[PDB]
Point group: D2
Chain length 438, copies 4
Amino acid sequence: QTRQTIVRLLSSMASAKEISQYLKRFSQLDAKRFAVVKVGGAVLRDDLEALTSSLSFLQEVGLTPIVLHGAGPQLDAELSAAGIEKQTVNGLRVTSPHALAIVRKVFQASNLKLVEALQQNGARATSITGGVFEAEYLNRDTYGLVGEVKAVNLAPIEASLQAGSIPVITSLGETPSGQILNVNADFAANELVQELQPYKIIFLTGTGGLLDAEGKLIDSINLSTEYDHLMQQPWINGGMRVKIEQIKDLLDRLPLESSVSITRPADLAKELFTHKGSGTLVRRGERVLRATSWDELDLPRLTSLIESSFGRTLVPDYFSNTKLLRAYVSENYRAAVILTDEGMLGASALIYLDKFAVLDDAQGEGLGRAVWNVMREETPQLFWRSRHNNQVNIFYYAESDGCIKQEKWKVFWYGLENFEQIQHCVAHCATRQPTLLG
Amino acid sequence: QTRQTIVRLLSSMASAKEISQYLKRFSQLDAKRFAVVKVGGAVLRDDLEALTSSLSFLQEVGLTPIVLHGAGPQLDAELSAAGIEKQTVNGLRVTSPHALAIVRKVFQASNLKLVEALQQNGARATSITGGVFEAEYLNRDTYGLVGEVKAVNLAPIEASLQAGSIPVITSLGETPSGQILNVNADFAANELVQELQPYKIIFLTGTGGLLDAEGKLIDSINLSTEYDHLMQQPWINGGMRVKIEQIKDLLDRLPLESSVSITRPADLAKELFTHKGSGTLVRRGERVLRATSWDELDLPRLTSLIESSFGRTLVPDYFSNTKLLRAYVSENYRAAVILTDEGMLGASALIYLDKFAVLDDAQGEGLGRAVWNVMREETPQLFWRSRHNNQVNIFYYAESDGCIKQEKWKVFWYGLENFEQIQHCVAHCATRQPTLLG
Amino acid sequence: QTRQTIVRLLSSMASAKEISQYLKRFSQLDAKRFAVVKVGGAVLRDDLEALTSSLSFLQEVGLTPIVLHGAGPQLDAELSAAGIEKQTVNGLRVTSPHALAIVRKVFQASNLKLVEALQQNGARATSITGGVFEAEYLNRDTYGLVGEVKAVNLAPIEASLQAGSIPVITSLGETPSGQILNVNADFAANELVQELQPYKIIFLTGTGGLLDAEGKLIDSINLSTEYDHLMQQPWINGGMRVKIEQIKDLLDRLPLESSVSITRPADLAKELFTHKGSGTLVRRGERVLRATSWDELDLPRLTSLIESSFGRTLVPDYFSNTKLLRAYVSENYRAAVILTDEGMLGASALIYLDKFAVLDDAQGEGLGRAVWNVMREETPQLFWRSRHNNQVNIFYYAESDGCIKQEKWKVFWYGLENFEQIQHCVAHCATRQPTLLG
Amino acid sequence: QTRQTIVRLLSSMASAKEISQYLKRFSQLDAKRFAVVKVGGAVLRDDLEALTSSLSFLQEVGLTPIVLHGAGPQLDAELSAAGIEKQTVNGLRVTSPHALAIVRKVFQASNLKLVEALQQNGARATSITGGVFEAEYLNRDTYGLVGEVKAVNLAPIEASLQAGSIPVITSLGETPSGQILNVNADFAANELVQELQPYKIIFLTGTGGLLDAEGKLIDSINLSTEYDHLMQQPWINGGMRVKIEQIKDLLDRLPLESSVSITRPADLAKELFTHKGSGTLVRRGERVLRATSWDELDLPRLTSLIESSFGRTLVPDYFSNTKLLRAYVSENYRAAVILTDEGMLGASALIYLDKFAVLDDAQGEGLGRAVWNVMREETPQLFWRSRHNNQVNIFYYAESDGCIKQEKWKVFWYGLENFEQIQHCVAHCATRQPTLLG
């Protein structure tokens, strides 16, 4: 029903090809196994009309947020009123008896505060407060009543998602013999999700997402590639690292098509239905290897890779003819760029995009985006050809630095070349390239 | 809406007067404060289609059962599989660590099993499993992990009854600092109800209700009166006593109009909408005093008691004329029978029902029934008069041992008198009684 | 679902036996084939909050009124504003071209006015305005544009009752080739109902029902019997006759269990769920024959009639022993009273009710009521016996003029006999009757 | 609710800017005043699963199709079975008495057939069959029983759209005095719509939309402009003309933002939510005038036209400096293109797009599209400049024949120029244009 049209809004527009695909490879597959919108107390306390106005939205079309709050700003206040709010021994905290006592009530209180504001706003939330997390206890006196979420029981939650309501769950434990000690909210979600196997999975926070050296919303990450030129580059202060590592911890644990998405609530919709939103997307992508030699490849794969990505198959024996400069391939072999040397003087002088090869089940996960992204950082001057009826021309027009058309082919180049230095090399790629498919 | 007609089905029939009243004195007054249908594991395990088919019924018209299971037959099995099912030190039980462990899972399991079978059957149940009962712990090693329900938190439940679903709750505790030890299911409900303030309040059991010496369903009890000629009479074996005392414990704690009702599930409807059903009703009634002297009474009360129970007020100065044999009055002064001596030879010989005086807000709680019940055990020969348009004539026709009509009065007598011994005394009450209102 | 409890409210009370039966012999059987609540413009114009608040009620539980208005008081005004409101040639009316013109708009207007006030009040009405009644035309100039409803098309209506809404229909015709001339609203409903085959079928009117010589709501009629001592007795002024004949016209055309019911709207519920309400019920009953001779009967029928109405069968050869005074039987043989002569002096002197024999599928249609009704107009002194566990004792207690009990039998008599003249004959029936079953 | 996200799916993509606007200028404004999806018997008869599966869709989100069938293929068969299916005197038809008779039944039949298949598929249709169209009669014997829809009564329809169901209406008349003669389905809708004032308004047909000389789906028309080079050009066979004129008749009668849309049913969604679909869109646009002289304009308008279409206002006194070659403006002054001559040799040689000026409330009606469309048919060689953050760059990239970027400006040209003939003139527009805003 919905998808019938979600894709219709899609098809006729730009980033449609890559999103509609996201709606075909996951449509139908449990309800609970939709989002897993883990929130937080700073966002509860502050903006709730919009946190719940957006949670409505999904659950009122079909996609049933299986929320996971953890109210801590307010807790941290209600706790120090009587006192004992000091000491955080390790990277985490500490809690005493007359103290869980205070959390469990604040967890309770604001938990209910949510589940109601949904029901009030028109929703159907259903408080789920305990019994889900097997919180074995890490240390007894050196921390007291805190514990590492040893397992998870989904029954309590599969009930509410069999009914059809937003399982508003909690950062609380519960040993074996039933003692309820504290757990890390984050080491928590890693584990719920592992159990549930989501598709989407948003991390609401009161901020706006991840930042960069500049301080601009970095609308993506793609670990298997972008991981290093990040995890080693210093505008990655402190806990942002850990915010990153953790989300990384996760997705290795999901399929491939998953994807975190730390956004803001007002935006939540924008984020979960747009190749945009306003929250750092963040996949796991795949391992990508660069090949200088056309011999360290599974060419045959590339055949079912260019037979599946392109209409026909490659004009026979093309592979023994290919002179190969620089090759880019996804461990899985669902994406390839073949970089051939093409020009006149010598064997040079221009570097040329002979093939792009993404499989349907991919330009959706943004693979077509990660593989290409990884050569336009190696190779800075770039000239290619794409027909007129090609889908992914608009991707190109993005990258393209300039473009020129012909009823038979469209041509794109990539790089700055002085006024007189351009025309010369631009007329080239539109002269050697007419003769590549000859 | 419903009451508009519940009373229409009512008005035109027999026990209608006393039930429709029950629907006018309690209509509108919270939702949660409807039933409190505490069940049990022997009824869960065995007949659930009907336990849930009846729970539907209410919650699907408006009256929202706020259920309270406690699965124990099945627990008692799942527990001994691994073992440690022996020892019950005091009138209650005992439990260990690797042991709550087993209950909490069985409580959980069958709790969910319910909440689902409602949602499946069309209902709207909503699991509520923990955090409600403040189970302080009674003894540490001499029993281990069991506790007396020190308080109750209604939030967890007022949520689901603000939504509109059947709060399917649990016999489980939870100290202060959050350790979940065992509680008595029964000492439990006493305390939920105290907090909630129900109106109806049914105790489902797999049996059929309370029995008697014979072994016939004793469709009532009324403690303040029937208490003794019960609580001292020996067909009250063992725990039946305690089943009684406990229900007694309760209602002292409610308004007056409340009322337990131990029935079976298939019957549940019959019970909660009929002056019948098939479950021992059981109120608290009121304290009733017998008066031999027309001077140890608040006559004035009786005036607003006969001015409110009868159209007019008593023909002035009737009270200084009354010669009084035997008087029956409810501590509250909402019910009276005045027993006057009426006859010819001497001042005797027949004993005569001069007045019955029940206030609207009463023949509903069955006061008209308890006060009269308490003289037809003192006074065995009984002759009275009631007009033709009187409501409560059908009560009479019940009691009445015989009856005779006159366009101006209807006459009833009560007792066995030989063939020739009747006619003689029967013609009497229809000769001295025409001249009482003269 | 509903019946599960409608009968529970029932069973425990008085007129329950005869009404619950009405709910078992018709439960399940189309939706449209429920009511057919034909209203009228004087009730529309005046009280609509209650006409629609009651129509809601049914259609919002399941029973879907298939309403049939006919607004005429208001029409009769809106018509004379421009004029031409004079002439009513025959027992009916007359209409011209620039004139239907005015009705069709007023029919339209108030038709819509209803269908909306239902949707506003929470209902689900659905305007149905035309195309249903095949109104062939009776006379062309001598009346103009009026016609006799030659047939009916149910499609337009079975649509809205397949959806589940109150088919708010109309007193309008429509020749063959589609010209919309006027029809009698009443000759209309006769014909809809014929087509539809209702069960209940109420005639709302702004009055309160049918009256009597006195002027008291005559809560019944039963044509096949009560027809004559009515249709010939002069407090039957004018059109009341026709109101009667017409309803008579109908039911001959339905099953037996049907039944008109001219009530008021505020009462509608009371009427359609109580052996009461406030509207002249009115069946067709059956043809009843009086038999003076126990030989002009199908005794065998009476065997399956007393074998089905009573537990066992009649003590063998009882039929050749019966000395028969006066016999009452329903053409169908679903009801009998056997009147035997019983006494001492001679073969006289008391007349005695040996048998009452109603079949389940009957005391519901009120047959048990019509057959008995028809002897207590022939036979004025009446003495009978009924066990203690007998269902229909309360019917008796109604009729009974007096009653007396015995753990084995209950005894009833019928008639006024002076103080000393009673006891004598009353001791009798409780002396010859102990020895009838001997 | 919906729009909150319909626009979110939108914003991030291509044709979003022009469609989301369509959702902001019409959001909130009656319900009935949504679509007016007039269908037809060839589409009913043939594909109904999809005609109703799409009608669902709208009415089940909020947008309530107020359908308008007219079943004729099937009629034309069911009519000739008995016969009299011959003669069509004028451009229309003819019908007799024993003949409407046959339509009214077929209209009825298939009308109901629809209203049910909606209710079956999950919808909420509600048959409306008559009383809506005031069909005065055009000629009595020379055609018989056919008529021109003199007016319309919306009551019958505003009822069902106050309830919230799909008013499935009909091609039938009804004189004044209520005779139901035939009407043209098409001259019908013109008149319903006039009364209702739709926004969208689709014409389903079993075909696929309008065609061209080639025979390709002509995804648009825009009368005030494209009217002539159409209405005079001969691949406009016969009734296609009339199909056109008629839709033209209409929209002159609506606001501006309206728009027919002859599509197919399976596509209906695609059409009514995409700048695409598969049905000839078709507006009325506005009257556009070409100006050769910068003096026959309301420049001041252009100021609030370039002050509203562009951030600031025009650099003061720009208007007395403008040397103007060719000007394009919409009668209303919501759209302008200013064509200035720009080059080196002489005052020539290139023609240059100095300004595009569309008002928000416009590029939605596709004005930005019609005005520009009307110069790229006059002026064939075209060179312009647009910043990087400009919204409408993707429109451009469409038109653009080639493009080149600079962090400060983006440059586009339009036309074929030989290999050596391009570079020369292409370097130009990227040399004279850097100095236009200087």
